Amino acid sequence: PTTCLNEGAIGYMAIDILQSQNIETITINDNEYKLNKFNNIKDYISKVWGAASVYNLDLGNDYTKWQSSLDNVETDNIKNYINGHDNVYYNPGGKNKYLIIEASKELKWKGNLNNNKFNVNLKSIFSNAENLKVGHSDLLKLFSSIVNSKGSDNQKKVLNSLLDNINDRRLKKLVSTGQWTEAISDSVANEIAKNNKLTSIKAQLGSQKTQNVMIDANGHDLLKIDYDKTFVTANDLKNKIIDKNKLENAKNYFKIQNNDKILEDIKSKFSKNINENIKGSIRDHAKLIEFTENKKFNTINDNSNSKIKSITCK
Amino acid sequence: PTTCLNEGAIGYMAIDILQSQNIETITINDNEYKLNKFNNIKDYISKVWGAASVYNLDLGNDYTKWQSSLDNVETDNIKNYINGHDNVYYNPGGKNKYLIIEASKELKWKGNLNNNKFNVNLKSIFSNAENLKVGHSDLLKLFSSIVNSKGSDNQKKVLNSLLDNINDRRLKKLVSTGQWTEAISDSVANEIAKNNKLTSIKAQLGSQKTQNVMIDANGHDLLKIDYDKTFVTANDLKNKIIDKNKLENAKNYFKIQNNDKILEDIKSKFSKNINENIKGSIRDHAKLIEFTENKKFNTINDNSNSDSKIKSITCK
Numbered sequence A: 001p002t003t004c005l006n007e008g009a010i011g012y013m014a015i016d017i018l019q020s021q022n023i024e025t026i027t028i029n030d031n032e033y034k035l036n037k038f039n040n041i042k043d044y045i046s047k048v049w050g051a052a053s054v055y056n057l058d059l060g061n062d063y064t065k066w067q068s069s070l071d072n073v074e075t076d077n078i079k080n081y082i083n084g085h086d087n088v089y090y091n092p093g094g095k096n097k098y099l100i101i102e103a104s105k106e107l108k109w110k111g112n113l114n115n116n117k118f119n120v121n122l123k124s125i126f127s128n129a130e131n132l133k134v135g136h137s138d139l140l141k142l143f144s145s146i147v148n149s150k151g152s153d154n155q156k157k158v159l160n161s162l163l164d165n166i167n168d169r170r171l172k173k174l175v176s177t178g179q180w181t182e183a184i185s186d187s188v189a190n191e192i193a194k195n196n197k198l199t200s201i202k203a204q205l206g207s208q209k210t211q212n213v214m215i216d217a218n219g220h221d222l223l224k225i226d227y228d229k230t231f232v233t234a235n236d237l238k239n240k241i242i243d244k245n246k247l248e249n250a251k252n253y254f255k256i257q258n259n260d261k262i263l264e265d266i267k268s269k270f271s272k273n274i275n276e277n278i279k280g281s282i283r284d285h286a287k288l289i290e291f292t293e294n295k296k297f298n299t300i301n302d303n304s305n306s307k308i309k310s311i312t313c314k
Numbered sequence B: 001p002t003t004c005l006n007e008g009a010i011g012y013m014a015i016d017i018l019q020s021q022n023i024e025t026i027t028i029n030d031n032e033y034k035l036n037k038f039n040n041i042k043d044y045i046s047k048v049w050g051a052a053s054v055y056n057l058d059l060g061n062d063y064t065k066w067q068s069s070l071d072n073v074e075t076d077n078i079k080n081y082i083n084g085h086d087n088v089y090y091n092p093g094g095k096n097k098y099l100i101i102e103a104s105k106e107l108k109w110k111g112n113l114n115n116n117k118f119n120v121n122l123k124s125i126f127s128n129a130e131n132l133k134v135g136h137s138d139l140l141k142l143f144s145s146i147v148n149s150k151g152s153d154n155q156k157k158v159l160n161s162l163l164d165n166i167n168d169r170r171l172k173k174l175v176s177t178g179q180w181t182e183a184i185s186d187s188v189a190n191e192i193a194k195n196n197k198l199t200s201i202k203a204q205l206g207s208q209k210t211q212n213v214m215i216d217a218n219g220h221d222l223l224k225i226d227y228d229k230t231f232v233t234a235n236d237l238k239n240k241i242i243d244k245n246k247l248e249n250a251k252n253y254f255k256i257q258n259n260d261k262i263l264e265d266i267k268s269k270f271s272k273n274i275n276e277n278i279k280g281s282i283r284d285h286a287k288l289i290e291f292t293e294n295k296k297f298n299t300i301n302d303n304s305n306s307d308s309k310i311k312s313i314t315c316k
């Protein structure tokens, strides 16, 4: 919701260059994909953005302002989303699971949209994408690479600012949600935890599988707390039996550490130290941050020849 | 089948060391595991080895000779297995699949055993193993680390030799089946193929799902071949409609390259360059090769030290 038009601008930027040079197909792996043709920005945005119908922004050729337009419309939702996190459950011994940190307030977007609708379908740039076996991040990497290769010097300056913008919000959301621990190596995670006075526990975020989470215990002994007395339990939430005092506790006992010091701390070591065994919703996020941070672009070749112009990638 | 007793000996040496020092538990991932107790070599092998009953070997305290014992029983099977590979199927255009390389001859082991039975079950060293979620290779590394940390010099010299034995055969088998490509990074895989005159195709090995395979095309143009005329088809081979000349063709057109040149080439670059995206039976095979080659042991600490009601050590 906060990096989508940043991505969209990069996708348009490549299309603007390719169409400008009469290039109609791209070679991904060993297949040829035929690019769609777009009249203007409104045409492209209408095609690749889910939420295009709802907002009706007016976007110029200043791509650094594309996200800002959305940012100004939704205002507080933008910062609140980036800093937001889910409900946190802790299983101290057995058999029950307790809500130790409550989720951030629910955000209502324009049109009562859903987080999926803000996605930009980089596959809609191709007419025959249905045959494509590439994920969103690599496609973003693909279009970003085209702008670096064929873009002007000023265009590359814009691409870099856009990539940088994606990294900042994407990483921050990852730290703020507590999901950063699962996305880097155990050794580095513990170093940052040691350095930042965080406590490592085994916890569940929303409906996700249990994972490694690091929380700020706020000068508390997690051994000494009575979870039955203090907190509500996940099965209790289902029964809609809720003790307000116990629910109130989830607000005040612990927090997820997202201040600038851990944020800087992780960013220095995040890029190098991604987990060997990772997959899922989280992996795309990790793929994205790594590329936008390091900026290792793919290579683009021009296919040479009554021509149809084309280019290849890996 | 060819490195199993090499692995078993490493496990016994650790048990021998730990028991010699009255140590009953190991700490793996903030957990405590209780070691089983073994009277002798036959007691341990009978418990951790699937095939112990079948062979009934007599194993001495020269552990480097443990594998040699099994090797003499099975003889030709050892070399044939290490160099063996499965059926290779190629889908040239669209809907049909052809046998382009025939599998090696069927091997019959003693008792007509199955390759799973040759496994050394390193969790059977612990009584409370069922909550343990650690793979075979990581366990071997754990026991190897114990032999390095607490073992005598003679024992450490044996361990180095045993590890070396495991590396050589496991890697050669990985090279011989054509599966090495899936266990390393694409660029390095492409590099070795280029240096070794290999052709990269998309192929299926046995009943496995499709993957990337590199074959020696023996100076052949895979574009110019008529697979329908030349080769049998996976459906045909399965149903036993077989053309004698076509099956013969699968013997002679291409080969899987496992000679020393490529073997050395892969051995130099394999350990550093394991594939980011890897899993299956193949991944454990890769971890094992990586560890035995590099030989970077874990750290073994005595927490409770020489004097305690229960003696223990920790790891990871």
Ligand SMILES: [Cl-]
Binding pocket: A001, A002, A003, A169, A170, A173
């Ligand atoms: Cl986002």
Ligand SMILES: [Cl-]
Binding pocket: B001, B002, B003, B169, B170, B173
């Ligand atoms: Cl083997």
